[PDB]
Amino acid sequence: MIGVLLMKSRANEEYGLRLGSQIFVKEMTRTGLATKDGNLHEGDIILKINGTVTENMSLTDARKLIEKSRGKLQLVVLR
């Protein structure tokens, strides 16, 4: 970990920092289909869930898309 401190003044009032969010694989259970399928890795960045892009999507909204899948979950994953 490193700390970074940005401080405004009349020389520069702009942080000049654009943030995003990404959805990632936190854990795969030993007993689940994710593990049994064997393709997904913990820490993988999920790019799409069932056609819908996940960049900047909230975790809550991404979880809703998983509940919506109705037993068919097509993921696209960064590699």
Minimum CB–partner distance for residue 69 and its own copies (Å): 8
Cβ of 23: how many Cβ atoms within 10 Å? 21
Minimum CB–partner distance for residue 9 and its own copies (Å): 8
Minimum CB–partner distance for residue 58 and its own copies (Å): 4
Quick one: residue 35, left, alpha or beta (phi over 0 = left, psi -120 to 50 = alpha)? alpha
Asked if 45 and 78 count as a contact pair (C-beta separation under 8 A), the reply is yes
Q: Which residues bind its own copies (CB under 8 A)?
A: 1-9, 12-37, 39-40, 46-47, 56-60, 62-63, 66, 71-79
| Minimum CB distance to its own copies smaller for 5 or for 52 | 5
